[PDB]
Amino acid sequence: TLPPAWQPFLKDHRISTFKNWPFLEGCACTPERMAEAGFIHCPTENEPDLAQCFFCFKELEGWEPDDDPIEEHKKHSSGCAFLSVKKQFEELTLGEFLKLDRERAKNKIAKETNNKKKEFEETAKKVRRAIEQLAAM
């Protein structure tokens, strides 16, 4: 029905990614709530409660039951345009939607770029230490 690239704009898709989420009925950060706030579940071996905004790509772990996902998105990525979106998906114009997808594309790049920056800085630390070790006797 709708191309895979665009499915994450749909709340029902986002919700579906929460296959094994621990925080269910009783909790403030339910899948319905997480999804409403724009989060995709994308857990690791390392942090199995991992969640990402599909739009600004901010990643957040260490979720607690009383966490309101919207308050958390606001706190941790205040500049995310998805937060400004008041209309429902079906009410958007194609122009508005396309304006949004372009912003997301740019956000993805900025995130990829910032990751590469971090990896480069890590590689640079290893190199520095190795050289210091060899400078010794």
Binding site: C29, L50, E59, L60, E61, G62, D67, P69, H76, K118
Partner: peptide, 6 residues
């Protein structure tokens, strides 16, 4: 919740 760490 909190920013993923590396």
């Amino acid at each position: 919740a909190r920013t993923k760490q590396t």
